[PDB]
Amino acid sequence: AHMTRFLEEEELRSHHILERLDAHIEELKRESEKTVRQFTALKGALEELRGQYIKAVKKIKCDMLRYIQESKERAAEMVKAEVLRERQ
Amino acid sequence: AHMTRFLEEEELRSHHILERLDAHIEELKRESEKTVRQFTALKGSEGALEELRGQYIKAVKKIKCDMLRYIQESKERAAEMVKAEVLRER
């Protein structure tokens, strides 16, 4: 029954990582409506907008790297626990 | 016996998704230079600024869609390991 706990954990880990991507998408969507409103109420905005997407994408790249790195450690931990189970 | 091959595979998948990630970041930067270039000309400037904004949001939705597929596959992998752990009780 080791692996069922592994899958339960993946299911949680999956729910969290997707939550923190929605957070990032929405922040982009909010900041960018504001900035498009500034420019429309006027007659520099290209840098705020592009600035924002770079922000959202950077944060997505960080969070995906932390997930990936956690995943590798988890796998290595299981490699370890398998070898411990070989004890006579 | 089994779990080192799981790790290896995890390493491989992890590098393939990060190639994918930088791949369509860089692609989606090409797509924006075209429409940014239009908006710079017009000083319809705003309808064109919304379109750009709609491309950034859409681009970051495609990144999410690839990231969901990756996650989904991890769940499928772990599921396959529940199965094979069950088969080894045989």
mmCIF file of C-alpha atoms in Angstrom:
data_model
loop_
_atom_site.group_PDB
_atom_site.id
_atom_site.type_symbol
_atom_site.label_atom_id
_atom_site.label_comp_id
_atom_site.label_asym_id
_atom_site.label_seq_id
_atom_site.Cartn_x
_atom_site.Cartn_y
_atom_site.Cartn_z
ATOM 1 C CA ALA A 1 0.000 0.000 0.000
ATOM 2 C CA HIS A 2 2.927 2.472 -0.452
ATOM 3 C CA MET A 3 1.801 3.639 -3.909
ATOM 4 C CA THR A 4 -1.773 4.494 -3.065
ATOM 5 C CA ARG A 5 -0.454 7.125 -0.679
ATOM 6 C CA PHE A 6 1.850 8.271 -3.512
ATOM 7 C CA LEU A 7 -1.167 8.780 -5.778
ATOM 8 C CA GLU A 8 -3.170 10.534 -3.074
ATOM 9 C CA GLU A 9 -0.292 12.929 -2.674
ATOM 10 C CA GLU A 10 -0.058 13.516 -6.476
ATOM 11 C CA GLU A 11 -3.760 14.275 -6.517
ATOM 12 C CA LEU A 12 -3.211 16.986 -3.846
ATOM 13 C CA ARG A 13 0.021 18.256 -5.442
ATOM 14 C CA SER A 14 -1.882 18.518 -8.725
ATOM 15 C CA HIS A 15 -4.738 20.496 -7.135
ATOM 16 C CA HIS A 16 -2.254 22.963 -5.556
ATOM 17 C CA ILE A 17 -0.059 23.622 -8.621
ATOM 18 C CA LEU A 18 -3.116 24.346 -10.759
ATOM 19 C CA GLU A 19 -4.468 26.745 -8.070
ATOM 20 C CA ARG A 20 -1.243 28.736 -8.126
ATOM 21 C CA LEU A 21 -1.348 28.890 -11.980
ATOM 22 C CA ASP A 22 -4.915 30.282 -11.840
ATOM 23 C CA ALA A 23 -3.669 32.882 -9.398
ATOM 24 C CA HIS A 24 -1.013 33.945 -11.907
ATOM 25 C CA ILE A 25 -3.355 34.009 -14.947
ATOM 26 C CA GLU A 26 -5.926 36.120 -13.103
ATOM 27 C CA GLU A 27 -3.366 38.673 -11.835
ATOM 28 C CA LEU A 28 -2.342 39.149 -15.495
ATOM 29 C CA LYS A 29 -5.972 39.506 -16.541
ATOM 30 C CA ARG A 30 -6.591 42.162 -13.788
ATOM 31 C CA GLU A 31 -3.503 44.255 -14.200
ATOM 32 C CA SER A 32 -3.932 44.280 -17.971
ATOM 33 C CA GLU A 33 -7.589 45.488 -17.961
ATOM 34 C CA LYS A 34 -6.476 48.308 -15.640
ATOM 35 C CA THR A 35 -3.662 49.289 -18.012
ATOM 36 C CA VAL A 36 -5.853 49.080 -21.108
ATOM 37 C CA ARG A 37 -8.320 51.358 -19.282
ATOM 38 C CA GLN A 38 -5.571 53.931 -18.508
ATOM 39 C CA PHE A 39 -4.644 54.132 -22.239
ATOM 40 C CA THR A 40 -8.322 54.316 -23.394
ATOM 41 C CA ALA A 41 -9.021 57.111 -20.885
ATOM 42 C CA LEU A 42 -5.956 58.856 -22.453
ATOM 43 C CA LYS A 43 -5.009 59.578 -26.144
ATOM 44 C CA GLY A 44 4.343 53.301 -22.197
ATOM 45 C CA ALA A 45 1.212 51.163 -21.878
ATOM 46 C CA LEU A 46 3.023 48.608 -24.153
ATOM 47 C CA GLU A 47 5.675 48.182 -21.449
ATOM 48 C CA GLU A 48 3.247 47.734 -18.585
ATOM 49 C CA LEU A 49 1.303 45.075 -20.513
ATOM 50 C CA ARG A 50 4.384 43.237 -21.801
ATOM 51 C CA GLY A 51 5.919 43.747 -18.352
ATOM 52 C CA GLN A 52 2.864 41.953 -16.907
ATOM 53 C CA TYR A 53 2.948 38.891 -19.156
ATOM 54 C CA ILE A 54 6.670 38.460 -18.486
ATOM 55 C CA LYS A 55 5.692 38.589 -14.801
ATOM 56 C CA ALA A 56 2.937 36.005 -15.136
ATOM 57 C CA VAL A 57 5.104 33.710 -17.257
ATOM 58 C CA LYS A 58 8.116 34.014 -14.990
ATOM 59 C CA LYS A 59 5.957 33.028 -11.991
ATOM 60 C CA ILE A 60 4.586 30.074 -13.928
ATOM 61 C CA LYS A 61 8.158 29.003 -14.770
ATOM 62 C CA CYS A 62 9.240 29.229 -11.107
ATOM 63 C CA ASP A 63 6.254 27.221 -9.773
ATOM 64 C CA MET A 64 6.654 24.555 -12.453
ATOM 65 C CA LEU A 65 10.384 24.233 -11.567
ATOM 66 C CA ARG A 66 9.601 23.808 -7.835
ATOM 67 C CA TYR A 67 6.958 21.089 -8.674
ATOM 68 C CA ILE A 68 9.389 19.272 -10.981
ATOM 69 C CA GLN A 69 12.229 19.393 -8.416
ATOM 70 C CA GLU A 70 9.832 18.157 -5.651
ATOM 71 C CA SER A 71 8.765 15.359 -8.003
ATOM 72 C CA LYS A 72 12.318 14.230 -8.493
ATOM 73 C CA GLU A 73 13.011 14.226 -4.781
ATOM 74 C CA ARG A 74 9.855 12.213 -4.125
ATOM 75 C CA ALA A 75 10.890 9.657 -6.698
ATOM 76 C CA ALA A 76 14.340 9.392 -5.133
ATOM 77 C CA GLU A 77 12.795 8.929 -1.740
ATOM 78 C CA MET A 78 10.848 5.938 -3.138
ATOM 79 C CA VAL A 79 14.005 4.559 -4.718
ATOM 80 C CA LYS A 80 15.404 4.762 -1.192
ATOM 81 C CA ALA A 81 12.432 3.104 0.587
ATOM 82 C CA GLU A 82 12.416 0.289 -1.965
ATOM 83 C CA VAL A 83 16.089 -0.455 -1.143
ATOM 84 C CA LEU A 84 15.352 -0.330 2.587
ATOM 85 C CA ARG A 85 12.543 -2.929 1.999
ATOM 86 C CA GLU A 86 15.261 -5.343 0.746
ATOM 87 C CA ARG A 87 16.637 -5.720 4.342
ATOM 88 C CA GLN A 88 16.521 -9.340 5.581
ATOM 89 C CA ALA B 1 14.409 -2.881 -9.309
ATOM 90 C CA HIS B 2 11.384 -0.858 -10.584
ATOM 91 C CA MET B 3 11.742 2.571 -8.956
ATOM 92 C CA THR B 4 15.043 3.694 -10.469
ATOM 93 C CA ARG B 5 13.467 3.483 -13.900
ATOM 94 C CA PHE B 6 10.618 5.640 -12.502
ATOM 95 C CA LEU B 7 13.223 8.264 -11.462
ATOM 96 C CA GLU B 8 15.030 8.142 -14.776
ATOM 97 C CA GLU B 9 11.730 8.646 -16.591
ATOM 98 C CA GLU B 10 10.827 11.488 -14.247
ATOM 99 C CA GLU B 11 14.150 13.210 -15.110
ATOM 100 C CA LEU B 12 13.446 12.765 -18.809
ATOM 101 C CA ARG B 13 9.811 14.080 -18.692
ATOM 102 C CA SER B 14 10.958 16.992 -16.546
ATOM 103 C CA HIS B 15 13.496 18.154 -19.159
ATOM 104 C CA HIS B 16 11.025 17.590 -22.040
ATOM 105 C CA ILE B 17 8.306 19.794 -20.467
ATOM 106 C CA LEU B 18 10.856 22.581 -19.749
ATOM 107 C CA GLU B 19 11.929 22.496 -23.436
ATOM 108 C CA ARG B 20 8.203 22.794 -24.321
ATOM 109 C CA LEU B 21 7.783 25.653 -21.900
ATOM 110 C CA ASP B 22 10.656 27.774 -23.309
ATOM 111 C CA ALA B 23 9.633 26.616 -26.812
ATOM 112 C CA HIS B 24 6.175 28.269 -26.809
ATOM 113 C CA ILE B 25 7.252 31.205 -24.614
ATOM 114 C CA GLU B 26 9.681 32.073 -27.401
ATOM 115 C CA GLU B 27 7.104 31.308 -30.133
ATOM 116 C CA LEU B 28 4.435 33.402 -28.381
ATOM 117 C CA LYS B 29 7.001 36.307 -28.216
ATOM 118 C CA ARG B 30 7.264 36.159 -32.076
ATOM 119 C CA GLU B 31 3.455 36.309 -32.367
ATOM 120 C CA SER B 32 3.305 39.470 -30.124
ATOM 121 C CA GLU B 33 6.046 41.488 -31.955
ATOM 122 C CA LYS B 34 3.754 41.443 -35.079
ATOM 123 C CA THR B 35 0.740 42.981 -33.275
ATOM 124 C CA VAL B 36 2.903 45.193 -31.000
ATOM 125 C CA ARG B 37 4.396 46.512 -34.263
ATOM 126 C CA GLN B 38 0.881 47.390 -35.510
ATOM 127 C CA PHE B 39 -0.132 49.189 -32.270
ATOM 128 C CA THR B 40 3.120 51.272 -32.395
ATOM 129 C CA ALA B 41 2.076 52.570 -35.861
ATOM 130 C CA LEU B 42 -1.493 53.567 -34.970
ATOM 131 C CA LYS B 43 -0.268 55.968 -32.151
ATOM 132 C CA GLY B 44 -8.019 51.857 -33.626
ATOM 133 C CA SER B 45 -5.002 51.889 -31.260
ATOM 134 C CA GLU B 46 -6.986 50.630 -28.298
ATOM 135 C CA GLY B 47 -8.910 47.782 -30.003
ATOM 136 C CA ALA B 48 -5.416 46.721 -31.102
ATOM 137 C CA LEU B 49 -4.076 47.095 -27.516
ATOM 138 C CA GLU B 50 -6.937 44.817 -26.310
ATOM 139 C CA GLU B 51 -5.990 42.264 -28.977
ATOM 140 C CA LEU B 52 -2.398 42.234 -27.706
ATOM 141 C CA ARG B 53 -3.618 41.848 -24.139
ATOM 142 C CA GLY B 54 -5.914 39.045 -25.301
ATOM 143 C CA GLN B 55 -2.844 37.332 -26.869
ATOM 144 C CA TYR B 56 -0.844 37.457 -23.599
ATOM 145 C CA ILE B 57 -3.737 36.033 -21.617
ATOM 146 C CA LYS B 58 -4.413 33.396 -24.267
ATOM 147 C CA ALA B 59 -0.654 32.540 -24.428
ATOM 148 C CA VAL B 60 -0.540 31.992 -20.664
ATOM 149 C CA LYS B 61 -3.697 29.862 -20.942
ATOM 150 C CA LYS B 62 -1.836 27.603 -23.471
ATOM 151 C CA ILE B 63 1.068 27.287 -21.014
ATOM 152 C CA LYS B 64 -1.437 26.201 -18.338
ATOM 153 C CA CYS B 65 -3.012 23.692 -20.774
ATOM 154 C CA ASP B 66 0.389 22.066 -21.353
ATOM 155 C CA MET B 67 1.096 22.154 -17.625
ATOM 156 C CA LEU B 68 -2.255 20.424 -16.911
ATOM 157 C CA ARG B 69 -1.417 17.664 -19.409
ATOM 158 C CA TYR B 70 1.934 17.140 -17.673
ATOM 159 C CA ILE B 71 0.314 16.901 -14.254
ATOM 160 C CA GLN B 72 -2.414 14.633 -15.616
ATOM 161 C CA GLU B 73 0.331 12.276 -16.928
ATOM 162 C CA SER B 74 2.053 12.166 -13.473
ATOM 163 C CA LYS B 75 -1.262 11.039 -11.995
ATOM 164 C CA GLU B 76 -1.534 8.388 -14.682
ATOM 165 C CA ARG B 77 2.060 7.233 -13.982
ATOM 166 C CA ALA B 78 1.430 6.919 -10.253
ATOM 167 C CA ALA B 79 -1.780 5.044 -10.997
ATOM 168 C CA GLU B 80 0.196 2.591 -13.161
ATOM 169 C CA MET B 81 2.450 2.114 -10.085
ATOM 170 C CA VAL B 82 -0.529 1.308 -7.854
ATOM 171 C CA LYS B 83 -1.382 -1.360 -10.451
ATOM 172 C CA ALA B 84 2.124 -2.878 -10.713
ATOM 173 C CA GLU B 85 2.476 -2.872 -6.930
ATOM 174 C CA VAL B 86 -0.782 -4.888 -6.932
ATOM 175 C CA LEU B 87 0.490 -7.219 -9.612
ATOM 176 C CA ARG B 88 3.650 -7.947 -7.556
ATOM 177 C CA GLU B 89 1.566 -9.297 -4.596
ATOM 178 C CA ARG B 90 0.790 -12.191 -7.027
#
